[PDB]
Design a protein around this nucleic acid. Structure first.
Ligand SMILES: [Zn+2]
Ligand SMILES: [Zn+2]
Length: 99
DNA sequence: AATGTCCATCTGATAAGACG
DNA sequence: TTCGTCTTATCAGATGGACA
């Protein structure tokens, strides 16, 4: 919901980010700020091996080398136990950060 | 050849918010 | 209600491939 990059006005991106003052830049635009200390010169031209879902905000790799949904890779790394197919939840839930 | 830049994509930290 | 707990978003940093 509703975020448009503060430099290039992008609307989608592999992964969002923020700068020192906590403004939402797209990936490339932010990975540019951390590194160069400069607004990025615009001019800018699968399923979980565990729960078999095709929807996640972040893909990872199981101990094997295969893509696992978010939820899963976190679960395993934390319980050293494949995440039950019971914890499976519906749709998507979102959250509001802010430093 | 050999290094540097740009950036998706992964692994790691922080912590939101559902729920006991 | 009120407050810990636990799952897992959503941030930050690491790693690597593509191109100059
Ligand atoms: Zn941008
Ligand atoms: Zn999964």
């Amino acid at each position: 919901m509703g975020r448009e990059c503060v430099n290039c006005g992008a609307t989608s991106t592999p992964l969002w980010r923020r700068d020192g003052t906590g403004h939402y830049l797209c990936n490339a635009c932010g990975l540019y700020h951390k590194m160069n200390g400069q607004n990025r010169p615009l001019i800018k031209p699968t399923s979980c091996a565990n729960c078999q879902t095709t929807t996640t905000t972040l893909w990872r790799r199981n101990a094997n080398g295969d893509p696992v949904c978010n939820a899963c890779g976190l679960y395993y790394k934390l319980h050293n136990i494949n995440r039950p197919l019971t914890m499976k939840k519906e749709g998507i839930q979102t959250r509001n950060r802010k430093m």
